[PDB]
Design an enzyme around this catalytic site. Structure first.
Site, PDB file in Angstrom:
ATOM      1  N   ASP A 197      -3.019 -12.005  10.486  1.00  0.00           N
ATOM      2  CA  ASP A 197      -1.709 -12.116   9.847  1.00  0.00           C
ATOM      3  C   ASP A 197      -0.550 -12.076  10.845  1.00  0.00           C
ATOM      4  O   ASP A 197       0.477 -11.437  10.603  1.00  0.00           O
ATOM      5  CB  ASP A 197      -1.546 -11.051   8.742  1.00  0.00           C
ATOM      6  CG  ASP A 197      -0.366 -11.324   7.824  1.00  0.00           C
ATOM      7  OD1 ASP A 197       0.134 -12.475   7.794  1.00  0.00           O
ATOM      8  OD2 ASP A 197       0.072 -10.380   7.133  1.00  0.00           O
TER       9      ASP A 197
ATOM     10  N   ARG B 191       7.575 -11.608  10.916  1.00  0.00           N
ATOM     11  CA  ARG B 191       7.759 -10.455  10.015  1.00  0.00           C
ATOM     12  C   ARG B 191       6.844  -9.291  10.403  1.00  0.00           C
ATOM     13  O   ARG B 191       7.134  -8.138  10.096  1.00  0.00           O
ATOM     14  CB  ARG B 191       7.508 -10.858   8.547  1.00  0.00           C
ATOM     15  CG  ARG B 191       6.070 -11.304   8.257  1.00  0.00           C
ATOM     16  CD  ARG B 191       5.775 -11.574   6.777  1.00  0.00           C
ATOM     17  NE  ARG B 191       4.420 -12.121   6.650  1.00  0.00           N
ATOM     18  CZ  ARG B 191       4.116 -13.411   6.769  1.00  0.00           C
ATOM     19  NH1 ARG B 191       5.076 -14.302   6.976  1.00  0.00           N
ATOM     20  NH2 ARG B 191       2.856 -13.815   6.679  1.00  0.00           N
ATOM     21  N   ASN B 192       5.747  -9.606  11.092  1.00  0.00           N
ATOM     22  CA  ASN B 192       4.712  -8.628  11.418  1.00  0.00           C
ATOM     23  C   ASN B 192       4.713  -8.120  12.866  1.00  0.00           C
ATOM     24  O   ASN B 192       3.781  -7.440  13.294  1.00  0.00           O
ATOM     25  CB  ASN B 192       3.340  -9.170  11.016  1.00  0.00           C
ATOM     26  CG  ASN B 192       3.159  -9.213   9.509  1.00  0.00           C
ATOM     27  OD1 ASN B 192       3.686  -8.366   8.789  1.00  0.00           O
ATOM     28  ND2 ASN B 192       2.410 -10.198   9.026  1.00  0.00           N
TER      29      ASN B 192
ATOM     30  N   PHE C 110       0.806  -1.227   0.000  1.00  0.00           N
ATOM     31  CA  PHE C 110       0.000   0.000   0.000  1.00  0.00           C
ATOM     32  C   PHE C 110       0.838   1.276   0.000  1.00  0.00           C
ATOM     33  O   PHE C 110       0.358   2.326  -0.416  1.00  0.00           O
ATOM     34  CB  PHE C 110      -0.987   0.030   1.176  1.00  0.00           C
ATOM     35  CG  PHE C 110      -1.909  -1.160   1.237  1.00  0.00           C
ATOM     36  CD1 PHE C 110      -2.105  -1.834   2.439  1.00  0.00           C
ATOM     37  CD2 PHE C 110      -2.583  -1.605   0.102  1.00  0.00           C
ATOM     38  CE1 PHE C 110      -2.959  -2.938   2.509  1.00  0.00           C
ATOM     39  CE2 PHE C 110      -3.433  -2.705   0.161  1.00  0.00           C
ATOM     40  CZ  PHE C 110      -3.622  -3.371   1.366  1.00  0.00           C
TER      41      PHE C 110
ATOM     42  N   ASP D 170       1.490  -4.525  12.368  1.00  0.00           N
ATOM     43  CA  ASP D 170       0.807  -4.875  11.120  1.00  0.00           C
ATOM     44  C   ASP D 170      -0.693  -5.106  11.329  1.00  0.00           C
ATOM     45  O   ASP D 170      -1.242  -6.130  10.925  1.00  0.00           O
ATOM     46  CB  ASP D 170       1.471  -6.098  10.468  1.00  0.00           C
ATOM     47  CG  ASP D 170       0.753  -6.555   9.210  1.00  0.00           C
ATOM     48  OD1 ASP D 170       0.575  -5.724   8.294  1.00  0.00           O
ATOM     49  OD2 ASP D 170       0.358  -7.743   9.146  1.00  0.00           O
TER      50      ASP D 170
HETATM   51  C1  LIG Z   1      13.700   0.878  11.332  1.00  0.00           C
HETATM   52  O1  LIG Z   1      12.844   0.556  10.213  1.00  0.00           O
HETATM   53  C2  LIG Z   1      11.488   0.618  10.418  1.00  0.00           C
HETATM   54  C3  LIG Z   1      10.660   0.225   9.366  1.00  0.00           C
HETATM   55  N1  LIG Z   1       9.342   0.251   9.473  1.00  0.00           N
HETATM   56  C4  LIG Z   1       8.741   0.657  10.604  1.00  0.00           C
HETATM   57  C5  LIG Z   1       7.349   0.664  10.676  1.00  0.00           C
HETATM   58  N2  LIG Z   1       6.645   0.271   9.602  1.00  0.00           N
HETATM   59  C6  LIG Z   1       5.178   0.136   9.582  1.00  0.00           C
HETATM   60  C7  LIG Z   1       4.758  -1.218  10.163  1.00  0.00           C
HETATM   61  N3  LIG Z   1       3.727  -1.488  10.968  1.00  0.00           N
HETATM   62  N4  LIG Z   1       3.693  -2.697  11.233  1.00  0.00           N
HETATM   63  C8  LIG Z   1       4.689  -3.352  10.632  1.00  0.00           C
HETATM   64  C9  LIG Z   1       5.072  -4.687  10.618  1.00  0.00           C
HETATM   65  C10 LIG Z   1       6.191  -5.019   9.866  1.00  0.00           C
HETATM   66  C11 LIG Z   1       6.865  -4.012   9.168  1.00  0.00           C
HETATM   67  C12 LIG Z   1       7.995  -4.339   8.412  1.00  0.00           C
HETATM   68  C13 LIG Z   1       8.858  -3.336   7.961  1.00  0.00           C
HETATM   69  C14 LIG Z   1       9.986  -3.667   7.213  1.00  0.00           C
HETATM   70  C15 LIG Z   1      10.258  -5.002   6.910  1.00  0.00           C
HETATM   71  C16 LIG Z   1       9.400  -6.008   7.355  1.00  0.00           C
HETATM   72  C17 LIG Z   1       8.275  -5.674   8.104  1.00  0.00           C
HETATM   73  N5  LIG Z   1       6.425  -2.733   9.240  1.00  0.00           N
HETATM   74  N6  LIG Z   1       5.428  -2.417   9.907  1.00  0.00           N
HETATM   75  C18 LIG Z   1       6.751   1.093  11.864  1.00  0.00           C
HETATM   76  C19 LIG Z   1       7.558   1.485  12.936  1.00  0.00           C
HETATM   77  N7  LIG Z   1       8.887   1.468  12.835  1.00  0.00           N
HETATM   78  C20 LIG Z   1       9.502   1.069  11.704  1.00  0.00           C
HETATM   79  C21 LIG Z   1      10.897   1.047  11.612  1.00  0.00           C
END
Ligand SMILES: COc1cnc2c(NCc3nnc4ccc(-c5ccccc5)nn34)ccnc2c1
Length: 280
Positions: free
Chosen positions: A143, A147-148, A38, A161
Site C-alpha cells: 500500500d 498518504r502512507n 482500525f 503504514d
Molecule cells: C501530526 O499528526 C500525526 C498523525 N498521525 C501520526 C501517526 N499515525 C499512525 C501512522 N502510521 N503510518 C501512517 C501513515 C499515514 C497516516 C496518516 C495519518 C493521518 C492522515 C493521513 C495518513 N498515519 N500513519 C504516526 C506518527 N505520527 C503521526 C502524526
C-alpha cells in the site's frame, strides 16, 4: 497477558525490548491527531529506560497475541532513516515516533508550505531509499502511496503504514472488490498478488503525486474500471513541473512486465542523478 511459551523460542528474549511498561507511557486521549479504520491515534509522552522525554504517536486498535508480538518484534528490528520505526507496544497500544508534519500527501497539498521541484524529487528519493531498505528485508508493502508516508520535524520522509501501523487512513481510495486500485499494478488488480515489483508500480504513482503536489490519480476513472482504462494503452500524464527523465522513470515503474520494472536500488540511483541537476 503475555505467554512466552506460545512464541517462537528464538524470539522470547526480544519481548523485553518491544514491550513498553504502562507506567512509562502517558497518552493524551483528549486530542485525536489521525483516524484509521482500525482505530484513532493520539499524542503520547514516552519515558526512556534512563528517563528521557520523547514525543510519540500512540495508535489504538479500538474499532492471536503470540502473532501480534512477533509482528512487533520483526518491525522493531527494522531501522532506516526513511522507514517509520516501532518504539514498542503498551498494555494493546502501538507506540510510534511522532511525525510533526503528518503524511506526505497532505504536506504537499498545504498552501503554507512551498517545496521546490528539487525538494519534491528529494521527497521521492527518500521514499525510494526507504523502499530499497524494505525490499532488501524481503518485505512487500502492498500500500505504498503519498498518504502512507510521513515527515518528521527535520522534513525527513519515512515509509509508514506497515506492520502494526498498517490501516486505511484515507478510506476514499480503497474499493471493495478493500484495495488501493489506483496505486495497484495491472497484475495485482487481476490476481490480488502483491510483490516488490508491484510496490515499484505504486512508487511510480507516488512520484506522479509528488510532481502534481498531491493531485488524485485518474480522477475521471471509477474504481475497478482502472484495468480497462490502463489496458487501452494509457498511463498518468506528465505533470507540468516533472522533468522528462523523471517521467521516463515513472513509465519504467509502470512497465507491463513486472520483471522489467526497475529495482528500488536502480530508482535510488536514477533519481539521485536527476535530483543532483537541480539547484534550490
Ligand atoms: C501530526 O499528526 C500525526 C498523525 N498521525 C501520526 C501517526 N499515525 C499512525 C501512522 N502510521 N503510518 C501512517 C501513515 C499515514 C497516516 C496518516 C495519518 C493521518 C492522515 C493521513 C495518513 N498515519 N500513519 C504516526 C506518527 N505520527 C503521526 C502524526
Amino acid at each position: 497477558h503475555i505467554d512466552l511459551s506460545a512464541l517462537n523460542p528464538e524470539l522470547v528474549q526480544a519481548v523485553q525490548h518491544v514491550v513498553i511498561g504502562p507506567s512509562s507511557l502517558i497518552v493524551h486521549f483528549n486530542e485525536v491527531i489521525g483516524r484509521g479504520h482500525f482505530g484513532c491515534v493520539y499524542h503520547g509522552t514516552l519515558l526512556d529506560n534512563d528517563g528521557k522525554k520523547i514525543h510519540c504517536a500512540v495508535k489504538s486498535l479500538n474499532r492471536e497475541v503470540s502473532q501480534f508480538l512477533t509482528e512487533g518484534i520483526i518491525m522493531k528490528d527494522f531501522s532506516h532513516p526513511n522507514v517509520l520505526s516501532l518504539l514498542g507496544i503498551c498494555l494493546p497500544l502501538v507506540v510510534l515516533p511522532y511525525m510533526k508534519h503528518g503524511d506526505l500527501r497532505n504536506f504537499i497539498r498545504n498552501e503554507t508550505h512551498n517545496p521546490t521541484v528539487k525538494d519534491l524529487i528529494g521527497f521521492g528519493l527518500q521514499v525510494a531509499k526507504g523502499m530499497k531498505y524494505l525490499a532488501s528485508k524481503k518485505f512487500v508493502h502492498r500500500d505504498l502511496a503519498a498518504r502512507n508516508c510521513m515527515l518528521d520535524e527535520k522534513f525527513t520522509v519515512k515509509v509508514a503504514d506497515f506492520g502494526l501501523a498498517r490501516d486505511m487512513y484515507d478510506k476514499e481510495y480503497y474499493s471493495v472488490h478493500k484495495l488501493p486500485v489506483k496505486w495497484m499494478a495491472l497484475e495485482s488488480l487481476q490476481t490480488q498478488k502483491f510483490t516488490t515489483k508491484s510496490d515499484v508500480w505504486s512508487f511510480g504513482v507516488l512520484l506522479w503525486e509528488l510532481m502534481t503536489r498531491g493531485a488524485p490519480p485518474y480522477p475521471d476513472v471509477n474504481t475497478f474500471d482502472i484495468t480497462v482504462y490502463l489496458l487501452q494503452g494509457r498511463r498518468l500524464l506528465q505533470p507540468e513541473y516533472c522533468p522528462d527523465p523523471l517521467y521516463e522513470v515513472m513509465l519504467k515503474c509502470w512497465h507491463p512486465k513486472a520483471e522489467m520494472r526497475p529495482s528500488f536500488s536502480e530508482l535510488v540511483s536514477r533519481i539521485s542523478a536527476i535530483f543532483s541537476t537541480f539547484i534550490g
